[PDB]
Scaffold this active site. Structure first.
Site, PDB file in Angstrom:
ATOM      1  N   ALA B   9     -82.872  97.435  -2.322  1.00  0.00           N
ATOM      2  CA  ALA B   9     -82.566  98.634  -2.075  1.00  0.00           C
ATOM      3  C   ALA B   9     -81.150  98.962  -2.478  1.00  0.00           C
ATOM      4  CB  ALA B   9     -82.868  99.765  -1.625  1.00  0.00           C
ATOM      5  N   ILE B  16     -76.515  99.316  -0.132  1.00  0.00           N
ATOM      6  CA  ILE B  16     -77.250  99.433   0.930  1.00  0.00           C
ATOM      7  C   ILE B  16     -76.946 100.372   1.941  1.00  0.00           C
ATOM      8  CG2 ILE B  16     -77.413  97.036  -0.510  1.00  0.00           C
ATOM      9  CD1 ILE B  16     -77.247  95.899   1.581  1.00  0.00           C
ATOM     10  N   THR B  55     -81.698  94.420  10.347  1.00  0.00           N
ATOM     11  CA  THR B  55     -82.368  94.550   9.552  1.00  0.00           C
ATOM     12  C   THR B  55     -83.038  94.726  10.900  1.00  0.00           C
ATOM     13  OG1 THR B  55     -81.704  93.772   7.424  1.00  0.00           O
ATOM     14  CG2 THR B  55     -84.938  94.199   8.166  1.00  0.00           C
ATOM     15  N   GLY B 115     -83.608  91.432   3.247  1.00  0.00           N
ATOM     16  CA  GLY B 115     -81.797  92.008   4.191  1.00  0.00           C
ATOM     17  C   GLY B 115     -81.120  90.995   5.852  1.00  0.00           C
ATOM     18  N   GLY B 116     -80.289  91.879   6.238  1.00  0.00           N
ATOM     19  CA  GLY B 116     -79.735  93.042   5.577  1.00  0.00           C
ATOM     20  C   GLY B 116     -78.532  92.287   4.290  1.00  0.00           C
ATOM     21  N   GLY B 117     -77.360  92.850   5.112  1.00  0.00           N
ATOM     22  CA  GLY B 117     -75.926  92.878   4.062  1.00  0.00           C
ATOM     23  C   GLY B 117     -75.782  91.380   4.135  1.00  0.00           C
ATOM     24  N   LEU B 120     -78.500  88.367   2.854  1.00  0.00           N
ATOM     25  CA  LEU B 120     -78.440  88.901   1.222  1.00  0.00           C
ATOM     26  C   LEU B 120     -77.286  88.707   0.618  1.00  0.00           C
ATOM     27  CD1 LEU B 120     -80.141  92.930   1.563  1.00  0.00           C
ATOM     28  CD2 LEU B 120     -81.048  90.372   1.104  1.00  0.00           C
ATOM     29  N   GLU B 251     -83.011  94.295 -42.642  1.00  0.00           N
ATOM     30  CA  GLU B 251     -83.494  95.306 -43.522  1.00  0.00           C
ATOM     31  C   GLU B 251     -83.022  96.732 -42.788  1.00  0.00           C
ATOM     32  OE1 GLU B 251     -87.624  96.612 -41.957  1.00  0.00           O
ATOM     33  OE2 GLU B 251     -88.421  96.820 -44.303  1.00  0.00           O
ATOM     34  N   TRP B 273     -89.874  92.342 -48.761  1.00  0.00           N
ATOM     35  CA  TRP B 273     -89.819  93.250 -49.810  1.00  0.00           C
ATOM     36  C   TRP B 273     -89.982  92.344 -51.267  1.00  0.00           C
ATOM     37  CZ3 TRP B 273     -90.946  98.037 -49.361  1.00  0.00           C
ATOM     38  CH2 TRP B 273     -90.335  98.935 -48.064  1.00  0.00           C
ATOM     39  N   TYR B 299     -87.259 104.520 -47.929  1.00  0.00           N
ATOM     40  CA  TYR B 299     -87.030 105.064 -46.708  1.00  0.00           C
ATOM     41  C   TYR B 299     -85.851 105.024 -47.305  1.00  0.00           C
ATOM     42  CZ  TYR B 299     -91.015 102.748 -44.798  1.00  0.00           C
ATOM     43  OH  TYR B 299     -92.168 102.369 -44.248  1.00  0.00           O
ATOM     44  N   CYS B 359     -94.247 103.538 -44.731  1.00  0.00           N
ATOM     45  CA  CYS B 359     -95.439 103.396 -43.084  1.00  0.00           C
ATOM     46  C   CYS B 359     -94.996 103.491 -42.220  1.00  0.00           C
ATOM     47  CB  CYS B 359     -96.150 101.495 -43.434  1.00  0.00           C
ATOM     48  SG  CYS B 359     -96.981 101.461 -42.725  1.00  0.00           S
ATOM     49  N   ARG B 379     -98.286 104.707 -39.832  1.00  0.00           N
ATOM     50  CA  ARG B 379     -99.854 105.781 -40.280  1.00  0.00           C
ATOM     51  C   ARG B 379    -100.554 104.104 -40.781  1.00  0.00           C
ATOM     52  NH1 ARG B 379    -100.243 103.217 -45.284  1.00  0.00           N
ATOM     53  NH2 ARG B 379     -98.821 103.434 -46.590  1.00  0.00           N
ATOM     54  N   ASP B 382    -100.633  96.901 -40.002  1.00  0.00           N
ATOM     55  CA  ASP B 382    -100.872  95.072 -39.106  1.00  0.00           C
ATOM     56  C   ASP B 382    -100.855  94.499 -37.856  1.00  0.00           C
ATOM     57  OD1 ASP B 382    -101.982  92.430 -39.207  1.00  0.00           O
ATOM     58  OD2 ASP B 382     -99.849  92.180 -40.962  1.00  0.00           O
ATOM     59  N   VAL B 421    -105.856  93.953 -37.452  1.00  0.00           N
ATOM     60  CA  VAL B 421    -106.218  92.860 -37.319  1.00  0.00           C
ATOM     61  C   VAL B 421    -107.307  92.209 -38.660  1.00  0.00           C
ATOM     62  CG1 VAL B 421    -106.731  90.656 -36.280  1.00  0.00           C
ATOM     63  CG2 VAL B 421    -105.901  92.670 -35.099  1.00  0.00           C
TER      64      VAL B 421
END
Lengths: 470, 470, 470, 470
Positions: B9, B16, B55, B115-117, B120, B251, B273, B299, B359, B379, B382, B421
Site C-alpha cells: 500500500a 508507505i 514488519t 515489506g518493510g521499506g 521492498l 476514423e 466505409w 456521424y 449504430c 443499438r 456485431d 454473433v
C-alpha cells in the site's frame, strides 16, 4: 402440522408425464430441482421430500433415496423398508403430522411435495401449500398426466427466471407464493427483482460520488447503471414504497396523444408537470412569451412529430415531422428483427424551446420468441422519486406495444447515466430499505383495445398491489 | 530458487509509513491483503509471506504469526523462535532457496514479499518479481519511508479496480505483471477486463436467440448488455485478437473533423466505409444521384452540425446546426456536474439521406474526482468485428476529451441493444475464446496538443500491444 | 499424452455386469465414484471421465452428461453431439492426446477411465495407468462381463477401506498404485495408514506433556492413544524409516517357542534383548544369582506357562501353568464368537523375577466375516523405536494365527498408555516426518505350515518393501 | 428483549487485564473467540458482539470493527460514528431492546457480550445470560481487573476442552449453560461428551457385525473402540437414560474392600450380582460345592490379593498375594511418572473358580500437570446396560484415587474390545438416541476422607443430575 412447498415441471397444457416417463430432458431443471430440495439455510439441518410410491419407483434404483434429504414415500399396500433416509407414511396429512414431531421438528428445515400426479392434485391448492416452484415448459408435446392450473385467486408470482433453451425446449422457473414470505428458500427469496432497485440505492448511498450545484443542493451519484425487469409473469410496480400508478398511466396516455399541454393532466388531477409549467417557472428560465402549461416540444411532440417546427401547444401538427410511435409499431408488426426499432425525445435543435430537457431520452425495442422487450436510456435518474415511476412507465409502454402488436411482453432493461440520491433523501430511503418486498402485482390490459391511440385508464387492471405504508 | 509477488500500500508520493505507523486506516485494503496472501488454488497447500524484522514487530503481538500462511521473517541479530508457522532466514535470496526445497517445494503454492521499506527497495524491481499488487492511495499525507516507482519498462498493468472511498481516502488495487500470467492468483487473473467481452461472446453463442433475415444470413442474439472498462491504468484494445487501432484513430479524427466523405479515409488507406460508399451500394439503396463516397449526414455531420440541411459532402456547413462536440467540451470544462453532457448521431429526419443509419447512436459524459467517464449506446452490436473496434473508438474519444479538458480518463461504459454473433463466426470466435488475455497496452496522448481539432495519428502512443495471431 | 486412473466396481470373480445392468445396488460406491471423479485440488479446474459408448448409453438419459466433469465418450459409428461438457474421440490414445493439448492442458486436473468392459480390458494394465480405484464386492452373483485380475507385479496396494455392508453385500475400496504417488487424489493419498503413526508423532511432539526421571532423561508424552491398521491388502511395516523386520520375525518365533533365553536370539544375530540380559544389567537390578541371558518369566513363559513356578531358562515347564497361546488357537477355531480370546504377559506375582516388566501387556482377538482381528494394549510406547516394531510384531502374530486357524487377517488395533518421544529424538523424528509414505509391502505366509510351533523365518515373504534411507 | 452469551478469558484468580493489556498471548484463544463470535448456523444471518467503549478502543485501530459481525459499542459521552457494521447504544438493556427489533430481529442469529470489566460485572450473572464461554487460564500472573466467580447455583458445565499449552501457559475452554440448550452455537452443542457414547451406539447398530450364540441370543458388534471423558469440570453420568449411580458407588466400595461376597451388596439393596451368585446359576456352571453369594476370586480379590490361593468368601486373606490397589496409590504419590501404574483382575490361573470372568480387565493410571488420568480395557461391552455403568464406575475410581493422592482428576479413557448391542435392545436404544443430552452433573468427594478404605456412599455428592425418563 408442518407446511410445505410444491416443486413440479409442467407443459403449457399443464402436462407432467408421457407414458410413466418425462417427454423432455432438461439437465438445468434437474439441477434446479436438486438445488431447491437439497440446500438449507442451516448446514446442520436437512429438507424432507414427500412423494407418491409411483414417483419413488420412477427414480432409477441406483439414485434412491434422493441423497441429502429425508425421503417420505406415501404408500397404500393394505412393501418398502424404513431407514435413516427413508420413512413410509399413510397420507400427506400423516407425513406432515410426523415432521411436526421430534426429532424432525428440529431436524427438517423445510418440506417439499414433488409428486406424482395423484399427490399433486391434492397438495397443489391446499392452504398449507406456502409456495409452488413451477418449471414452465414452452411445449405442447402429448402428456397423459396433468395437474390443475395454479389458483391465481390465492397464489401470486414472486419471481420468474429469464427463459432458457435446452435440448430444443424453451422454459423458465416461476415461484408462486400463497397470499413474511420468509418461508421461501433464501435463493428464491433473493430473486425478487425489487432487490435490483434496493441494492442499487444502497450501493449509491454507500459508494456514490458526493457533489453539489449553484443552489447548494447536494447528491450522492454513480454513473452507468443497468436494471433488468421480467414482465412475463408480473409487473414491476415497487412494493417497498407506493408508486403513483394512476399518474404513470395518465402521463403515458398523454405522451402517446402527442400533447405538450400540462393542463390536460392538471384537469385530471395529475400535477407532476405543474412545477415545470407555471407562469413563475417559465419566466425564471426566460420563456416569458410562453402560456402557462405550454411545456414546448417535449416527449409527446418528439414522439409523434420529431423534426416539425413547434409554435404553441394548441397548433394542429397533423402530418408534420416523423411519427416515431407509428414507425415503432410498424417495425414490431412488419419487420420484428429490425435493429432500428427506436423512439427518441432527444432533439438538440429543440432544447432551447423545452420547459425541461428530456430525461428518458431514448428506447429501443426487440422481438424474439413472440415477446417484445424494451431498453430505455435515462440520462438523469433520481433513485428516490423518478426511477420507480419510470420503471412502471416504460414497463407499461412495453405491455401496451406488445398488446397492440399481438405479442407478449418480455423484459424491460433500465439504463441509467447519472444515477443519484439527494443528501436530504438518505434518511427516508434507509427506512424504505428496511422493508422486505411483497410479490409484484399482475397487470392485464383490456383485450377489446387494439389501437395505440384508443386506451383509457380503465383499460389497465392491476391485481394484488399492496405496498408498504407512506 | 522460487519466484515471488509483492503486496504493498503506497501514497501518490509512493510513501508507505509515517512514524513506524500507517498514516491511513483502510479495512478494505487489509481484507485485500488477507485475501491475496491467505487464499490458494489448492485447499491443501498454503502461501509464504516474506517480511523484514521491522514488519514482523509492527504486527500487534496478538495477531502474530499471520494465520493460515508460512511467515518467513528475515533477521540480522549477529532473537525469534522458529515454529510450524514461523521460519527465520538471513536474506530474501536464502528464503527463496529454502521454499524451493522440501517440504515447502510442495507445501507452498505462492510466495508474497510484503515489506518493510528495506526489503521492498531490493525486492520490487528484481527479475524474480513476477507481479506487484499495489494499493494506490490518492493522498499526499506526509510519509518518512518510500519505495521506488514501479519500473514501467518491465512491469505492465494487468488490472486496476474501480476506485473506492473509505475513511476520507480514495484508493484502488492495481496489479502489474512482469513482461502465461498463470502465476497470478486466480482472483487477480479473472479481473482482466477482456473477460467481460469473452464471457459475453460465450453467453451469446451458448444462449442467444436464433434469427434470420431476407438474404438468408443467420445470427445468435441477446438484448440489453453492458460492459464497463477502466481507462485509468491501461487502454482496452483487445489482446485475444488484433484490433485495427490505426483505423480506430483515423476514423475518429475523421468524425471529429465533421467530414462525411469516405474518400478522406480511402486516401489514407482506411477502407472500413468503402462498402457503404460505392456506386453499386448507393444505387442499391436508391441514392442514384449521390456521388461515390458521399455517405450523407452520418456521424461527423450530426456531431458538428446537428439539425442543418445536408446538400453534399463538399458544402461548407460552418455556423449551421448545433455543434454537439463543442457543447460537450464546454460543459466538461465549465459545468462538469451537468446531467446533459450528451452527443448524439440519432436524427430521425435525416435517416433517409444516410448511406447507413448511426449504430453508436449516443454517448453521455460524467465528471467526478477529476476523471471523465463515458457511456455509449450501441443499438446493433456485431460481437466479432464491430464491438472490439467501438470499445477502442469511444475509449479513445474519452481519453481525447479528458486530455483537451485538463482531466484524466475514468471509465468507458458500453451499452448494447441487439448484441449478435453471425452463425458463420461461431467457429472462429470459439478458437479466439481459447486465447488467454495479455495485459492491455498503455496509451499516451501528446501533451503539446490541447484543442480537439488539432490531433493527428502520431499524437497517440500505444506501448505494449502484442495481441494473439490472426 | 496425459496419464489416467481407473475407477471400477467388481465381484470376487472380477465381474462388472449381469445383462447390461449391475447385479448390486450400493449407494456408498456411487458416492465414492462421484467424490473421486468430481472433486479437484483446484476449485477452478475439473476432471475428465473417459468412457465407452456402451457406458455412456447405460447412464439414465436424465443424468447425462456426468455433471461437473468433461465427459469423453469413445465412439465408432463409421451419432453423439459435442458440447462444453461432452467430447467424442476415436480411441483412448486419441482422448489422452486431446487432453494434453489446450485448453484441456490447464482445464483438466486428472483423467479417470470408468469403462465399460471393452475399454477397461485395454486401459487397466497399460503403463500410462497411474492407479486403479477398485470397489471389491464380496459376492459370487453371476456376471457376463469381466476385467483382468490387477497385475500385482506392477500395481501395489496404497490403501484399502474398512469393509462396509449395504443392501446385503459386503465391500471395500482399494486403491492400487503403479510401481511421488502425488498423482493420487488428495483424499486417497491421505488414506495411507502410515499417516496414523506420523500424525500421532507430530501430535505428541507439538502437544505432549514435558517430563523427566532420576537419570535426567527427558520426554514429551500423551496418554490413551489408538491406531487401527488394515491387514487385508497390505502389511503395516513403516516406509518413512526402515523397520527391523528380521528381528520382528525372530523375536515373535522366540515368544511362541516359550523361551526366556536371550542367547537363542543372540546366536541368530538378534541383539534387541542384549541390554536387558547382560551380567552388568542383571547385577544393577539386584538379580546377582541370575545367569547372563536368563530374562526370567517374560513374554514367552507367560504366554505358554502362565502361573507356573519359574526356576531358570533351562527348566522343562511342559504341562506347567496355563498355555494361553493354545487356548487362543482353540477359541479361534472352536468358539470364534467368544469374548475372552485373550493372551496376557501381565502377572503381578512374577514382576520381581523379570529382567524387564512386560510392555505389550495384553491382546484380545475377534472373529467376524471369516477375518481375525487383534487389539493389543501397550502400557509404555516409545514412538521413535518400539511402536513401529510392535505394530509389525502384533500384525505378524494376527497373520500367523489367522493362517493356522484357516482364516484371513482383519485389523490390528494398537492401544497406547504412556505414548512418548524422547527429547533427544525430536530432531531426527522431524526429519522422518518430511518423508512421504510409500505403499506398504505385501506379506505372504507359506501355505505348507499349519501349526503355530512349526514356522521359521523363511516362511514369511515380504514383497515391495522399499523404505526411505537411514 | 434478546438473550446473550458471554465470551471471556480469565486467570485462576479470575483476572482479565494487567495495565489495559492482556498478561498473556494465546493465538488458540483468539481463534476460538473469532470462531464462536463470527460463525452462524445460517450463512445469510450474522452475530452481534456487544462491548464497552474501553474494549472498543483496546482493539488496534486497523482491525476495527470486528469483521463479519454487527459491533454494538455501549457509550456514555454525555464520540463514535454509526455504520452498517457499528451501532452505539446507551446500555446493555438498550442494545438488547434494539436487536429484538427489525431489521436485527431476523438479521442477527445470536448476541455475544465480550467485555470489558464494567459490562461483564453486570452481564455475567443476569438471567438473560443463556451461557458463559470461559477460557480458563492456569496462571497467577498479576491482574488489575477481575470478574465475579461463575454463580454455580445457576450455571452448570456443558463442555470443557482437553487442556492445551501455548506460549508457556496451560488453558482450556469451558462452556457453562444457565439451568433445550439449543441456544448454544452448534460447534459447542456438539462438544457434549455424551455424544461420544450416542454416536458409538448409532455406529454399532448401523454398521456392527451380526452374530449369534448357543442359546439363540443375537448381537450387532464392533471391535476396538475408544471414548475419552473429561473429569475436570463435570462427571460423565449419562443424561439420555438414568444410570444406577447408587449401585456404581456401592459396587466400587465393595471392590475396594476386597470382598467377593454378593450378599454384602444384596443386604444394601444392590442386586446387580444376584444373577451370578444364585444356587441355580452356580450349579449350572458346575460350582455345586460353592455357597450362594460366593462369586470366587473376582475383582475385589484380584485387586487386593492377586496370586493368593482362594478358598471361600469368608477366609481372612490378610498379607496374602499382591495388593494392586495399595501399589497403585504408592506409585501415584511416590513415583507419579511410572509407566507401570496398573491394576488388573485378569488371572488365567483363577478363571475356573470365578462365577464370571472379569470383563473390565485392566486399568492404567497416568499423572501430569497435577491431574490423575485412567485408561480402562473392557473385553466385552454391552452398549445398552454395562457401558454407561462402567464409565461412571472407573470415572469414580479415578476421582477417589486423585482425592486420596492429593491430586485432581484428568481424563477417563474407555477402551472396548467386543462392543455390542443386543438385537432386542435396538428399538429402545433408538428411542434413547432421540433424547438430547443435558449438562452432566458435578461430583464432589468429602474432604475429611483421605484413605481409600474409609469411604461410604454419603461421601459422594452429585449435583444437577436430571436424566431423561425411563
Amino acid at each position: 402440522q408442518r407446511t410445505y412447498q410444491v416443486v413440479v415441471a409442467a407443459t403449457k397444457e399443464m402436462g407432467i408425464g408421457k407414458d410413466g416417463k418425462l417427454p423432455w430432458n432438461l439437465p438445468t431443471d434437474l439441477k434446479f430441482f436438486k438445488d431447491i430440495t437439497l440446500t438449507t439455510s442451516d448446514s446442520s439441518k436437512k429438507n424432507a421430500v414427500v412423494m407418491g410410491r409411483k414417483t419413488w419407483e420412477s427414480i432409477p434404483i441406483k439414485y434412491r433415496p434422493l441423497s441429502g434429504r429425508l425421503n417420505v414415500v406415501l404408500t397404500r399396500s393394505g412393501d418398502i423398508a424404513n431407514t435413516e433416509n427413508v420413512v413410509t407414511c399413510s397420507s400427506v396429512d400423516s407425513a406432515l403430522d410426523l415432521l411436526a414431531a421430534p426429532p424432525y421438528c428440529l431436524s427438517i428445515e423445510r418440506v417439499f411435495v414433488i409428486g406424482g400426479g395423484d399427490i399433486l392434485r391434492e397438495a397443489l391448492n391446499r392452504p398449507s401449500c406456502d409456495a409452488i416452484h413451477l418449471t414452465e415448459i414452452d411445449t405442447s408435446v402429448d402428456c397423459d398426466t396433468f395437474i390443475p392450473a395454479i389458483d391465481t385467486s390465492v397464489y401470486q408470482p414472486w419471481s420468474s427466471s429469464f427463459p432458457v433453451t435446452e435440448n430444443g425446449l424453451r422454459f423458465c422457473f416461476t415461484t408462486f407464493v400463497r397470499v413474511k414470505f420468509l418461508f421461501l428458500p433464501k435463493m428464491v427469496f433473493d430473486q425478487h427483482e425489487e432487490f435490483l432497485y434496493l441494492n442499487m440505492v444502497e450501493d449509491i448511498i454507500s459508494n456514490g460520488n458526493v457533489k453539489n450545484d449553484r443552489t447548494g443542493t447536494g447528491t450522492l451519484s454513480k454513473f452507468g447503471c443497468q436494471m433488468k425487469f421480467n414482465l412475463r409473469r408480473s409487473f414491476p410496480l415497487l412494493t417497498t414504497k407506493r408508486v403513483f400508478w394512476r399518474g404513470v398511466v395518465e402521463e403515458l396516455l398523454w405522451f402517446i396523444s402527442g400533447s405538450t399541454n400540462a393542463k390536460v393532466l392538471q384537469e385530471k388531477g395529475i400535477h407532476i408537470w405543474d412545477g415545470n409549467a407555471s407562469r413563475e417557472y417559465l419566466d425564471g428560465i426566460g420563456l416569458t412569451e410562453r402560456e402557462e402549461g405550454d411545456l414546448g416540444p417535449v416527449y409527446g411532440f418528439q414522439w409523434r412529430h420529431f423534426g416539425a417546427k413547434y409554435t404553441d401547444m394548441h397548433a394542429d401538427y397533423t402530418g408534420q415531422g416523423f411519427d416515431q410511435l407509428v414507425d415503432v409499431i410498424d417495425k414490431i408488426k412488419n419487420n420484428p428483427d429490425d435493429r432500428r426499432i427506436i423512439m427518441s425525445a432527444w432533439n438538440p435543435s429543440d432544447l432551447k424551446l423545452m420547459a425541461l430537457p428530456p430525461c428518458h431520452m431514448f428506447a429501443q425495442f426487440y422481438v424474439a420468441e413472440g415477446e417484445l422487450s424494451c431498453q430505455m436510456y435515462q440520462r438523469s435518474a433520481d433513485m428516490g422519486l423518478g426511477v420507480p415511476f419510470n420503471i412502471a412507465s416504460y414497463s407499461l409502454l412495453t405491455c401496451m406495444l406488445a398488446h397492440v402488436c399481438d405479442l407478449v411482453p418480455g423484459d424491460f432493461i433500465h439504463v441509467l447515466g447519472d444515477a443519484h440520491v439527494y443528501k436530504t433523501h438518505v434518511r427516508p430511503l434507509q427506512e424504505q430499505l428496511l422493508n422486505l418486498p411483497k410479490p409484484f402485482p399482475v397487470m392485464k390490459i383490456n383485450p377489446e383495445k387494439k389501437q395505440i391511440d384508443s386506451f383509457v385508464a380503465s383499460d389497465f387492471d392491476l391485481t394484488g398491489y399492496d405496498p408498504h405504508k407512506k
